[PDB]
């Protein structure tokens, strides 16, 4: 499938250096030395029915964002034409391994030394350094999160699911494996998968590939509300009736009422949003998490160069010369279209969708306001902070509070049955 | 992998296959223990030598290349190994390099050991290359087309320009006689006692010569 | 005694509770009753008149506090929580408890342990709150007060209290009291349940969301708990497959295909964790094998349980009967070689010991008794020599001593000396030193691996010897084992999931027994037999040696080939399968060394491991370069019985491979070891990381190290104090998670302030090879840190005062809190007539009726009054004097001393406001009893409040804090249109914005905001069935 492995190092819209401050690492390295903080990252969700929030990190938006800033700073050292490990600070940072592991304070001499400079947009290959280049396995392991960084990094905007629908995803072992999780919350099986590859990413055309395909696909179908109690996908569909809020629990169900048919014809596409409120959502992060493994086990298609910023084009590992341009939206009009075509089916009443929209856009308002306020606070911080710099999250613009451009995309992603 | 993972890529009808060696090594060929890994390697080396001997616009081999470069094992021994040296020489003669001494059809067992004795010495490589299980290089314009048919483990540095002219021989043999030579000087100078001290480790003196007839 | 046990099983864990009561650990203490009842007040202002419970009783002082286990039921408690007392009482002994090295006081301690003590407080409240919540009841309302809801009902008894209390919502009455318009803030549409789950008819919910008088902390903690737990669940199919592929494709369990509702089973973790835990096992076992003997026995047992092997002497017997003759000779070599047999009684076992030794090889070597040796040279005039030597020959390829064929050849060498000898340039040892005396290849000469160094007629024997060996010494191979997703991997000397063998594996060709006689062992004994043959073909062994004896020894070795033992192919093919299958059933995963056939160039030498470092080197490569852990041990055994075993094959005639295994394995597949191991060791490593993080709040390290609360008095100290703290924690732990192991040993050994886990070995040529782990996640650390920072702002909420105080003449008529700031009389180090002090001391003298004074660090001349700034620590020098100097001079003398302690607990003292007096007594006391380590909790003299105004009264008080901390006060005098006298406090907006604020989300976090105490919770309607009820175990 894929024997080529690369990545890139983040750029900035105006910062002369890394904005990472040791404080972040510390409050994360309070335990251990890992470069990936997967465990409490995932557990920091507070079950996702609500979020975990702090001044240091109010959202896993912020969490993973600084995770990224950190690891961007981290990689600086060992990875050069002059590859190496040990005794050169990156804000007192030192690894302790030839496999480039362990993270502690610089030695006294190394505390005095100047830190390694950084550069922006520093794309590289993940196969140059020899040590890990001897162990395929830990290499793959790290790659599934190098990707999680990279993909979100490649765009001035958010994450993307590479949704794919294909028939062979029906098989005996398949529906077998399916059977394991009836009446099950998406999030928990996501956890199981994080496990079942963190141990070992399954092999290229693994059973579990087709599975997670089913998972994310049915997820997004319910997400748009594509399938439902009557429009059913081999009679399976998640639920979360509490719609209108920032937390959903979509769960497997079988409908013995009507079933919708899958015509032949394999299809797929690449979805992002256009509202930077996703910081309440998690499902995007897990989809990212798994799609990373999908890459690290299976060589996957690429997108058009024009689909991405010019400086970030023609990437062997990610940026091919063709591939379906992204698909953006905003959750507000997302649930709008969702409930609307649902009632189009006549399984509702009008006041239903209406009372949905009320609370939904109420929440939209409030939390956008909170977002912008925290932005102001961080600005004043920077003003007070000539030397201890940071961005809680990927900096944004109000220009990102409008059209989802999702209109025809509705029918597009809808015609994937 | 620590029992030796070597492969010749160019397709046999044998087909896709890898290879491991066992826990035996040849005592013979004094003075060497001989782990068959590197032994069969030397044999491949002989092959490449034999190859480099002639040069004809139809030298009808079926494969110029038959040797084996490390598929796996690079995690137990570094580059200063005799074996890494051998693989260097492997890809070198693969380019088409060739010994600067007349070469037997079959080069004696003791010939081989003496060879070892030589190469094992101190010094450097003439060839900067250091290959990779990440990838094996394709030379500048070494006259061979095995690259022209395969990719699996092959990447050329288009940047490459380290080449030579072309030359081989039509006869190589021996003579007993201490035969003539004539000097053809050069330009620069040097220091006298220093050349003395130089030759002070090179002379054949002292010895009794055949006084002969006056 | 618990060591092999720690390789045997674990203590009973506790992972699931069910909260049969309340989760949050907080009630209010209303302690000071109000001034009620007043007279012109009609009784119409209260509920004890028409008797429905008020959510909060009325009291002049009432403040929310933590209390554990006062409202909840369980079938299991969780190990010694912490509760405190009102600020009118002292629990302080904590601080004079468990760590002090010298105490006498009932009120006062060493400021040192302070941070440690509150640390303990923190972590123990971390400890106690881990219970699991069983979703709670409901029952439809019937009075239109409510919305007729399903009230959260208790299926247990006497729940009407909570209804009355958790729901001032449920409260409603025409009256204007604090609580009245307070609860007026709430709405009615966001009560009780938020939502729920429902499917699978005839059932309750699968999870529920409801509103409860409840905190956020314990909620957050136990949810994090739940989640990390959930990180390990499984579904049938994989457990099925585990069975199956480990069932040799024979025995079955079937997976459900019916609808899955909920079947919880958190077990499976990452490999690295079990790896490193067993690694630590391997650490703390250095240099004893008396522990290994039991499991060796057990192995032999369980393998004897699974094998069709029979041991038989009769083969030997009938075989050796090989002579018919007339008797006049010197000897009967028959009976001679029989001397080894002893022609049953009573051979039972002990063939499989070193064979197991193969399978845990990485740690021990196998050898045989030097007593078995004839240590007495030799002469071909003694064939006893050749008999024994050949016994050894047999044993050797079954020996793991790193000099086996070395010593083989060595026997011969020792034999023909002066008749035949070998090359040698060293007399460090000569040819005349025996076995158990020659170990290293650097003890083995060039000729030892150079058959050219001798002429093959000068000594044809040894030449063919070495040559044979180089050509035929047995060949090794390997095999896989088990399932990784259910067993993992402990193999670190080798790519994952591999299992070597000194032997080559040969598959069989049909399910029946196989008649096999070309075995490298078959061929092998054939080799050495013919070697003997060729030997005795010597010209020199017949100046008196007879044709009779000739044919005798010929047929001897010939029929020695004629043996038909059934073990060779037995062990060559399917005994490997016995090994593979016992491996899982075998507890204590293995470590075995990679092998050579003839190689003397890659033998490992040593092992080196660290748990910590002493130098500024942190890169484990250079770090372990001097830290180390090497153990090496022999196991001596028998050659006789084992050789026999080789020489005694007899099997049942109806034995057939397939069916024998089919029947045998079946009973033998109940195994529960691994799960218990996972639980224990998971908790083990978590204890590691938690503990070291605790330490991190004490010390400095190359580790990323930071601390935030250090302003609390405590400093670093000896490793003694360190491990003191450490084992206090350990004991708290073994209590908390309820097991009874020995633990933290490497951590309780040297320097724990720094850690490093690097584990390596050294080769024939150095070239060491090492491993180090990366830790998995650890939530408890996140928790305790968050808590440290919680209390980093909620100290006073626990009687905990930061800032400092000031003693001064407080003589006035206005009523106002000593914990309030002065309306007009604040004092600090920046006023005129303020003075700070070094050790400058020169007391003047008032005789001559003159102006008495004390000398300032300035050098001035000072009487006793003013605004002064002093290190009380100095007061503790000869405080006897100190008190004597200033008792009155402050009493009605008007000095003012801003004074430092930093942090403390305090004391409350209420009294009638409607009178006046002084507070001089506890003034005197709380002053005088200061020692460097005596410090009573700061007293405080505050009157008691009322509902209305009065004329004023005199007032004389002494000391004030530095910072505001009266947050602890929750409220006062509820059933009141207001609290007038004193201040007035109110049920803080900071506690119920859930309903007071209609615009709050279903969830919200008060960090570091004054936290709530009414909170929405998701109660778990899961069920975690046992691991056997779902699985259909079928033959």
Numbering used by the authors:
A (entry chain P): 2 to 418
B (entry chain O): 216 to 429
C (entry chain B): 241 to 1275
Quote the authors verbatim.
The particles harbour 10-separate genome segments and comprise two principle protein layers, the innermost composed of 120 copies of protein λ1 clamped together by 150 copies of σ2 (viral polymerases, λ3, are attached inside adjacent to the icosahedral fivefold axes). The outer layer consists of 600 copies each of μ1 and σ3. The array of μ1 and σ3 is interrupted at the fivefold axes by pentameric λ2 turrets which enzymatically cap the mRNA transcripts produced by the polymerase on egress from the particle. Here we demonstrate that vitrification of infected cells followed by cryo-focussed ion beam (cryo-FIB) milling and cryo-electron tomography (cryo-ET) allows high resolution reconstruction of assembly intermediates of a mammalian reovirus, allowing atomic models to be constructed which throw light on some of these fundamental questions.
In addition virion-like particles of two types, ‘empty’ and ‘full’, were observed. For stars, analysis focused on the fivefold regions using emClarity16 yielded a reconstruction at 6.6 Å. For the empty virion-like particles, reconstructions focused on the fivefold regions and pseudo sixfold regions yielded reconstructions at 6.5 and 5.6 Å respectively. Thus purified virus particles provide a good model for the in-cell empty virion-like particle indicating that the internal RNA does not alter the fundamental organisation of the structure, thus at the fivefold axis on the exterior of the particle, there is evidence for the σ1 spike being attached. Although there is essentially no RNA in these empty particles there is evidence that the λ3 polymerase is attached at the expected position to the interior of λ1 close to the fivefold axis. However there is no evidence for the lattice-work organisation of the N-terminal 181 residues of λ1 B subunits on the inside of the particle which has been assumed to play a role in organising their assembly around the threefold axes, indeed there is no evidence for ordered structure for the first 259 residues of the B subunit (in the A subunit there is density for residue 241 onwards). It is possible that these termini play a role in interactions with, and possibly organising, the genome in the mature virus. The observation of only the SLP and completely assembled virion-like particles suggests that the conversion from the SLP to a virus-type structure occurs through the relatively rapid addition of all the remaining structural components of the virus.
